[PDB]
Amino acid sequence: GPMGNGMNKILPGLYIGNFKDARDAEQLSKNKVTHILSVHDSARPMLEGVKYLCIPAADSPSQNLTRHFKESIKFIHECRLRGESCLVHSLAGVARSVTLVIAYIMTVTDFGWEDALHTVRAGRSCANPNVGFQRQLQEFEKHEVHQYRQWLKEEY
């Protein structure tokens, strides 16, 4: 459905879900989630046992997410390098969270944004960033993802 059917594994240690999944103790335990990147209107730390990165942002083409790619990638990558699991969630798990995960996949592979979206959709079929987020991902691919790949190599 339009908000998914529970949080979904995208890659080892990387999940996308909706706001309800992000408070679901059974899902968080089953998936060993210890880091939550919360990107939605009212994002703030809630639960115990979880390291948070909170990005207040709207699901609108007027919302800039590119300025949050670097911090999001650092947060996800350092969690995954330690063998831990990160949930990226928005309200629906469809746009804001998906866009940050696409940027991550693009930085840890050779993929452009469309192949990264295909990867996300294989795990979470409802993924569908708005056209504004799509244009931000396209600019990222043509002008900056190569810088981020080099930063990732130099840092880790």
Author numbering: -1 to 154
Sentences from the paper on this structure:
DUSP22 is a small phosphatase containing 184 residues, and the sequence contains a catalytic domain as well as an N-terminal myristoylation site. This enzyme is broadly expressed in different tissues and plays important roles in the regulation of signaling pathways, such as inactivating the T cell receptor (TCR) signaling pathway, activating the JNK signaling pathway, and regulating the phosphorylation of focal adhesion kinase (FAK). The phosphatase domain of DUSP22 consists of five twisted β-sheets and six α-helices, and the structural scaffold is similar to that of DUSP3 (VHR), while DUSP22 does not contain an N-terminal α-helix surrounded by the N-loop. In this region, the catalytic activity is facilitated by C88 in the P-loop and D57 in the D-loop, and the hydrogen bonding network is formed by D57 in the D-loop, S93 in the P-loop, and N128 in the N-loop.
The S93 mutants were combined with a second mutation, C88S, to produce proteins for growing better crystals, which improved the resolution (<1.6 Å) and helped to determine the structures. In the crystal structure of C88S/S93A, the overall structure was similar to that of C88S, and the side chains of D57 and N128 also formed a hydrogen bond. A water-mediated hydrogen bonding network was formed among the side chains of D57 and N128, as well as the backbone amide of N128. The position of this water molecule was above the original position of S93 and it did not form a hydrogen bond with the P-loop. A93 in the structure was independent of the water-mediated hydrogen bonding network, and the comparison of B-factor between C88S and C88S/S93A showed that the positional disorder increased on the three loops. The S93A mutation probably resulted in the unstable active site structure and decreased the catalytic efficiency. In the crystal structure, the S93A mutant shows that the P-loop is independent from the interaction of the hydrogen bonding network and the B-factor is increase in the three loops, suggesting that the conformation of the D-loop, P-loop, and N-loop cannot be stabilized. Consistently, the decrease in kcat is observed in the S93A mutant because D57 cannot form a stable interaction with S93.
